[PDB]
Amino acid sequence: AVKHLIVLKFKDEITEAQKEEFFKTYVNLVNIIPAMKDVYWGKDVTQKNKEEGYTHIVEVTFESVETIQDFIIHPAHVGFGDVYRSFWEKLLIFDYTPRK
Amino acid sequence: AVKHLIVLKFKDEITEAQKEEFFKTYVNLVNIIPAMKDVYWGKDVTQKNKEEGYTHIVEVTFESVETIQDFIIHPAHVGFGDVYRSFWEKLLIFDYTPRK
Numbered sequence: 001a002v003k004h005l006i007v008l009k010f011k012d013e014i015t016e017a018q019k020e021e022f023f024k025t026y027v028n029l030v031n032i033i034p035a036m037k038d039v040y041w042g043k044d045v046t047q048k049n050k051e052e053g054y055t056h057i058v059e060v061t062f063e064s065v066e067t068i069q070d071f072i073i074h075p076a077h078v079g080f081g082d083v084y085r086s087f088w089e090k091l092l093i094f095d096y097t098p099r100k
Numbered sequence: 101a102v103k104h105l106i107v108l109k110f111k112d113e114i115t116e117a118q119k120e121e122f123f124k125t126y127v128n129l130v131n132i133i134p135a136m137k138d139v140y141w142g143k144d145v146t147q148k149n150k151e152e153g154y155t156h157i158v159e160v161t162f163e164s165v166e167t168i169q170d171f172i173i174h175p176a177h178v179g180f181g182d183v184y185r186s187f188w189e190k191l192l193i194f195d196y197t198p199r200k
Contacts, residue, residue: 003142005157007105007107007192007194027200039200040198040199040200041198041199041200042103042196042197042198042199043196044194044195044196045165045195045196045197046193046194046195048192048193048194049192049193052192054192054194057103057105057194057196059198092107092149092152092154093144093146093148093149094107094142094144094146094149094154094157095144095145095146096142096143096144096145096157097142098140098141098142098159099140099141099142100127100139100140100141
């Protein structure tokens with residue numbers, strides 16, 4: 001498996017319904033992009049470094065290196081980013097192969 | 101289940117043998133915790149985190165937030181920190197319940 005992980009902070013003006021919209025729309029990409037095997041999001045409860053801002057995590061899982069790239073440049077994923085970038089103040093992106 | 105997510109940047113001077121030891125030992129560490137369900141680590145291949153610079157991810161699955169908090173002050177985890185904290189330039193920790 002391979003993973004696409006994002007860590008973000010919303011802009012202060014974003015409403016709670018709009019945060020719900022953000023995650024519901026992202027999660028729904030599994031119904032649009034065949035390459036997506038699983039998707040989860042979460043809100044951090046620990047807040048170890050409040051000064052760093054980040055509050056939420058989204059993790060997407062794929063079968064292989066081939067399918068994740070198909071996801072990255074899918075028009076629906078690109079479109080999501082181009083529109084909903086307006087929602088975040090800070091973003092970290094990771095693409096990687098889980099290992100132990 | 102709850103995810104314990106670590107995001108880090110190693111100091112520039114840290115060697116590849118040092119990074120190998122770091123992750124081998126952290127995986128050994130979480131395996132002594134009965135509450136641990138899964139662990140993986142990964143190195144980002146995308147490298148779009150700019151000035152932030154985070155390169156590596158560790159994700160541990162635990163039964164509960166309580167088992168995480170106990171884990172954090174367990175002397176083996178405190179000891180891991182004592183020995184290896186000089187390895188990382190930046191580190192973020194998040195704990196969250198995956199949802200869809």
